[model samples]
Target: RINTVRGPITISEVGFTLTHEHICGSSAGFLRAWPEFFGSREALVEKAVRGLRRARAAGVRTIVDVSTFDLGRDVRLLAEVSRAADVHIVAATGVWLDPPLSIRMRSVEELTQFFLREIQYGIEDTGIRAGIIKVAITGKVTPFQELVLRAAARASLATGVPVITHTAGSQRGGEQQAAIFESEGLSPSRVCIGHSDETDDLSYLTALAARGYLIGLDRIPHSAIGLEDNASATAFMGSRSWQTRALLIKALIDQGYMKQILVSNDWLFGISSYVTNFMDVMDSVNPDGMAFIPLRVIPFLREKGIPQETLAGITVTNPARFLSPTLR
Candidate 1:
């Protein structure tokens, strides 16, 4: 149902949607990071088909692709995949905020106009439509970022679509993003602040949750992303305790915010092999090879005294709301 690159996708029956997931393509940074890896549409489609098959078997029926058109999003491929597999796919119309802004991005007005057009196209034309617009703010919110945020917020209001944001490298940063949206007269409930678990500030996270926004703790294997200069992230995971992350999640739930938090594998644009190798690691750990990383989390949580109800909420129900065509 991609109506346009910028879209108003109709996913009324969409269920169990992954709010942020990249199936068949790579981002610009990923291509640059691994230049040996050629990222063409043909190659991406092959990878995506294999990955989407696995995801379908895992009970995923819809995926809200936050891949921005400017970031090399190809909805045509998604539509083909969806039609073949019977998976509902959503497109996106927004800007990816990184260094080297687009030359057309002279101001928020320009960006808003750009995004509105793309969104409208997705909504009106493409059979694969967009559920939301995605914008990323890597670190501190700069003037350029502020403009993008404002543009996204305004466009969302104008179109009745929700907004999702990627907050890279910060704790409680999601709340800040929601605040920026709120400043534009958008409700926090209409926003999702992603990757909050990348940092460990419970106070910061709780503050964001207090504002009725979704907090994503979906980045698994916190250790892989650790060992950098920043201890803030490591400390958030409780110096290597799964309990720390669990406790943070529990706190959010106890505060009646469980419905606003979502979980994911944080499967990146690259690193698909890790999924397979971890399966071998599981075999190494046991004859069954059940030690696989992503496969092991549900069981670990089951053993960690996590109630099945809570698991369903974080992994299923909350995520459904985050991507629901009906939610605020």
Candidate 2:
């Protein structure tokens, strides 16, 4: 049985998991407010349950939630949601750095200890263990981020869990982050540089990928506002077509950069207003706007010239190897 934050559990072998999504998040002081927003574990759990069913119908069985400990991440609630949904759930440990992570109870050593305990033992002896380790650095690598990185490296050494990190808009820095892991004697096989598509540096991406870091290119449903030089809603709705996304992926793949790519919604259910709002188009295009990326854009690639085998690598094999270390 796999030990996760919720408890110990058995997972099905569907093999295709999104590897990242947030089912729930509330900060430390928002405990009472969490139930108010989503209305208890029972109510909010249904949304995640339904989403999991939808993912299963779409051939996705596993999903990793990277929302960290301080972000009101509820592993117990996630376990309930996963049970209700019947989807395999992977939870995260470590910290998120939006306000620079000035938690009294969380230092690099403390965070590393927490991750080690969770990865090594089930949370609260309920028998659920965290499947992966997650840490985030905002804007640039700060001393706090450096601390977290060291913790992540320690966790990798202690538990053999893979490391996934949030990064700024540069793939070169991602390579450097991977180098930090290597410098600690950890292999790049266990590292993922999250939100990588936000970066414009393809050469940096390719270099990190060559060194075995998994880079996520799952950014889609382009920003509807501020994506153009507009100040009002009546302006041309800044939207990117499936054709545009396909062309970007095609060019990258043709240029031999598809091997390290993985895709996901990065969909924050709430609070990330623009991302959610931009996706409203899915209702008109299909049942869910997100389907357009896989259903239409990938088909466009086949129609052009990309072989199905290559597509499979980008969509399937590449992500699988990153998520399950055994696959490597």
Candidate 3:
């Protein structure tokens, strides 16, 4: 069984899953401290429910929220969205980008202990257990980020849950993350190198997949939104990025690495006011919103005579296998 927000469900229950997404994402306690910054909790929840409903209508079944302890990962809000949208929501426990001062001060053991609590026990008093572990690296992996990566590896090994990572643009950050996780004795198959789409280099992706790692071809729709890395951000918005990404995906599938490939938008529903305009940017491009994949990307692949079962393997079966916590 795979863990979801409400409870565990059989693998069959997880259909058309988005391996990475965020229903609620901001600073830690941003909802409580400055609801006005984004919207009130009720407002954010309403927005999330609306977007998720659109996704559901577009045939999205489950979404793994990569938001971690510090990224305003509101489990209660997550559960509410899950119930309202009738979509399976999987929460994560770990850190992102630059961790909070408290988390930064934590040693690997300290971080691992709390991650274990969330995975085994539950997050805070919410009784909502996290289903995955998230750790990220931007540019170079810092000393503390390495600690966080190690902690994620430890947590995944101890609990049988999978670990997902955020990587920098074309700099091979996920490769470094893979090395760190492996050094911790975690199998590469138990971890997903998130944002494998960040680099169009099939060689880099093949290197990791050859090591038995799951390649998260998430961020297919990310270029709609701008980020700190303006250079790569612009690179993702153009036609060539789409062509390269599409060709890269087809190459991986043709190479028989389909089992290791996962496709998703990596879209976030809730956001602070400062970045509110960015959603409009995404909408301007992908009018289908969360449905961009099932509606847009899938059809493009279908045009190339990609089979029905191949699409399912990328969007459905692969996610089920990676999130199942059972080595296949």
What lDDT tens digits, residue by residue, belong to model 3 across residues 139-186? 768888898989988888888899988887556887788878889999
Residue 260's lDDT within candidate 1 is: 82
lDDT of 2 by residue, 164-263 (tens): 8877533356755775677777777788787666645667667777787777655444334333433332131324443554465666786677876676
Model 2 lDDT on a 0 to 1 scale: 0.62
Candidate lDDT values, in order: 0.60, 0.62, 0.82
Error of 1 at 170 (Å): 3.6
TM-score per candidate: 0.75, 0.79, 0.92
* Residue range with the least summed lDDT across 10 consecutive positions in model 1: 283-292
Number of backbone clashes in candidate 1:
22
